[PDB]
Amino acid sequence: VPRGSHMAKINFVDHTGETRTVEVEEGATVMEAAIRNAIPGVEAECGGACACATCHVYVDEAWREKVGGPSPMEEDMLDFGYDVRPNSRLSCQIKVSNELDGLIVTTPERQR
Numbered sequence: 001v002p003r004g005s006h007m008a009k010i011n012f013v014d015h016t017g018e019t020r021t022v023e024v025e026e027g028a029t030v031m032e033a034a035i036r037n038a039i040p041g042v043e044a045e046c047g048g049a050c051a052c053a054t055c056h057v058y059v060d061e062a063w064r065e066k067v068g069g070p071s072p073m074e075e076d077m078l079d080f081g082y083d084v085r086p087n088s089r090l091s092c093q094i095k096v097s098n099e100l101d102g103l104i105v106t107t108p109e110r111q112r
């Protein structure tokens with residue numbers, strides 16, 4: 001919450017394979033790390049209220065265990081995503097912590 005504090009690196013790989021790295025404060029969500037940095041391929045129609053699926057991302061294999069799977073309420077919204085995979089998550093549901101420093105997520109070809 002303290003601005004610019006305890007920053008964690010988050011790597012956003014778009015559908016073409018181009019990676020964009022940003023730093024976001026611990027406690028913020030991965031969706032906020034993308035929106036605040038104008039990252040392509042990620043949207044936040046509902047602003048992080050788990051009411052849409054436009055913040056959909058694929059969690060890199062190496063980070064799946066630490067990030068975890070989607071919650072039941074996240075699943076219901078994920079049903080509206082495009083090409084939802086086992087490693088799919090709504091980025092606004094992923095809270096950044098120290099152990100996610102270096103996280104890699106890939107944005108899908110389509111959000112809506």
Ligand code: FES
Pocket residue numbers: 031043044045046047048049050051052053054055077090091092093
């Ligand atoms: S921004 Fe709407 S569900 Fe994540």
